[PDB]
Design a protein around this ligand. Structure first.
Ligand SMILES: N[C@H](CO)Cc1cc(I)c(Oc2ccc(O)cc2)c(I)c1
Ligand SMILES: N[C@H](CO)Cc1cc(I)c(Oc2ccc(O)cc2)c(I)c1
Ligand SMILES: N[C@H](CO)Cc1cc(I)c(Oc2ccc(O)cc2)c(I)c1
Ligand SMILES: N[C@H](CO)Cc1cc(I)c(Oc2ccc(O)cc2)c(I)c1
Ligand SMILES: N[C@H](CO)Cc1cc(I)c(Oc2ccc(O)cc2)c(I)c1
Ligand SMILES: N[C@H](CO)Cc1cc(I)c(Oc2ccc(O)cc2)c(I)c1
Lengths: 248, 248, 248
């Protein structure tokens, strides 16, 4: 069997919260080294990649590698029945027929379990390439989320301009324009060689920031001509990365 | 006249909150010994019974027994204009023509009063029978409400299974299934002779738990073949009971 | 140029919150002595008057008087991107072509700016007359807002009756009636010579109380036959006044 006990169960609730708007169904790939999901959003625009490593769980067993096709709407609904304090265990027989979620409240007197039916999915097989980035900005996840919420009241698209000493996000539309200038030092840190300037759909960034509760930092990785990576580290465990192509 | 002063006015606000979704109009029966309501829900599915005893009020007068036909939507709207801290008095001349609600804030400088027109209702005359229960579970009202909210994401119907040492609530539907196991000891206490297992519409239980703020305990009384009683004691005053038939 | 720095930026956010439901576009008249707006609501029912005096700003410059036609929906949206803690500056070149709002967070590491296009408006030219009031009631803005919210559940119209020692607000409708009696002393103070009794659309009062966060006091000025003035002082700076004709 597969069995992953997570004492900080809320990590899972939050991971589902951060994917349900983007993806209806995907493979969770289970292996010795942990849990891996890679999928395109349901409109084929961004690509989402999730890593939850073994070590990050309180107990972790995997006897055979599995590819469980999970309906994320369903998993999300079920994770909403877990309390924020609960210990959450994922468990599946190796035939990968159903997935169990078990929620045990800390006062060990209530225990919930849900079994969700798994699907077989034919999934578009994709490989994320080797990529160098001219530019990596690391900033509080809260700020980034507010910038994206704010500019979306102004237009559809944000232009991100990155220099050695600061980053600027701008948009414009019917009502006029806006920008927000952030300076290098919560901490803001820029590592760049080339300066970049790219443009992105605020709609997708707004979905990405559903991940905000997973981490108090977000990292933006950019380079001329290649997708932006918006990464949230799930402390001591892995990351959730979103990939989005610049507009032209 | 009829006059009931309630210093903890919020009890009334909460009682209306716990009935408005279930019942549009009903008789409040006023007598010496207190206030009594018995009515079927507006779809003829569950039966609601309310007791507010004399002693429970700070002052209580009743000179003639009354049967006031009250529109509960109306009474609810008006009770929403009372502050949570207010002293609330119900008052009616014995002709039962209108009902007054008076709300006096504790800083005795603001006083509100509303008069609502009363109706004459022809009401379906019902008698609740003598019943023994194989099984009575007493548990925190909050938990019960969360169980009902949670399982309703899974299916329509909850199967309640009761043993000497614990109770289990299960449901299933399109997305898979769920159950929650609660153990006997907030305190959970089971008094049973026969074990029972019955099934109920989560829709009605969900309405019943609108009563949750009235008490931190709820009591479930069950027996093969007869309606479940979901009871909330209104401390030092009476109870609100809901009755619901098991499905088959 | 025109430039007004406001360290307590939230005053502006709140002023827009208190006008956006009432008015789509209006002239902000800029002069040496401060900022002035006067406009009818978009249905031609009430008149709104705003004063923000020079002295009230931390820095204030005006080199030429301006009449900026501002879309208030737009200004409102943009002011929603300011944090409550931010320092807000209004700035316009004297040609009055666009208006800039600059939001600098207190940790001087983030700075936002928005430019909104200005319009030329042909506006209905009105003069508010000299008026004496029989009656002026000063009361907590919170209470007034609750009275208006509450009575609107009862009817459309509130009858305000004012005596030397107290004020009463009443309404009635389908469900029955209500009144709230407030006594002269939070503080309630009546200055009257003639007693008045007038009736007003609760719809407009409800819009007016969108101003509640600007001040913890509201002042009602009344007189037979003339509009009511609902005034909110914006401490150390000016006022927002709404004018509304009694019904007959
Ligand atoms: N045809 C595919 C989607 O339906 C296109 C696609 C493939 C890949 I691999 C993508 O992911 C990445 C990730 C990092 C990169 O540098 C480039 C593409 C994306 I966004 C879209
Ligand atoms: N930190 C300094 C004030 O103490 C001045 C300052 C402020 C900001 I915001 C900065 O950041 C940016 C970022 C992007 C821009 O386009 C302009 C300034 C810099 I560099 C210096
Ligand atoms: N025909 C009636 C409803 O329209 C049926 C009815 C009558 C009674 I009295 C009920 O109440 C109880 C209460 C306790 C019991 O043991 C049995 C019925 C119910 I639920 C439905
Ligand atoms: N309390 C013990 C752990 O310290 C073990 C335990 C846990 C639960 I939840 C229990 O309750 C139930 C209730 C219903 C069931 O169907 C199964 C266990 C029992 I009995 C013992
Ligand atoms: N025809 C105008 C509106 O479209 C009517 C109008 C004019 C004025 I000046 C008003 O304002 C006041 C303000 C104070 C007063 O004593 C009288 C009118 C109002 I309310 C409506
Ligand atoms: N303050 C006194 C109780 O300590 C009694 C009291 C209460 C109220 I409310 C009052 O106010 C009103 C206001 C309007 C009315 O129509 C009647 C009473 C007065 I004058 C005295």
């Amino acid at each position: 069997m597969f069995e992953a006990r997570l004492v900080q169960g809320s990590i899972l609730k939050k991971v589902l919260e951060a994917l349900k708007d983007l993806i209806n169904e995907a493979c969770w790939d289970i292996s010795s080294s942990g849990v891996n999901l890679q999928s395109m959003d349901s409109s084929h625009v961004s690509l989402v990649q999730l890593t939850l490593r073994s070590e990050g769980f309180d107990t972790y067993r995997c006897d055979r590698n599995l590819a469980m096709g999970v309906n994320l709407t369903s998993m999300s609904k079920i994770l909403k029945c877990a309390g924020n304090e609960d210990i959450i265990t994922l468990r599946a027989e190796d035939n990968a027929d159903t997935l169990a979620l078990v929620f045990e409240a800390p006062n060990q007197e209530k225990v919930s379990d849900y079994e969700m039916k798994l699907m077989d999915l034919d999934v578009e097989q994709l490989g994320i390439p080797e990529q160098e980035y001219s530019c990596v900005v690391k900033m509080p996840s809260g700020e980034f989320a507010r910038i994206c919420r704010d500019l979306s009241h102004i237009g559809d698209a944000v232009v991100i301009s990155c220099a050695k000493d600061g980053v600027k996000f701008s948009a414009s539309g019917e009502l006029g324009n806006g920008n927000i200038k952030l300076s290098q030092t919560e901490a803001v840190t820029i590592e760049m060689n080339e300066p970049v300037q790219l443009t992105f759909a605020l709609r997708y960034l707004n979905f990405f920031t559903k991940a905000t509760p997973l981490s108090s930092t977000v990292t933006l990785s950019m380079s001329a001509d290649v997708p932006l990576v918006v990464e949230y580290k799930i402390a001591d465990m892995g990351h959730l990365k979103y990939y989005l192509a610049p507009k032209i």
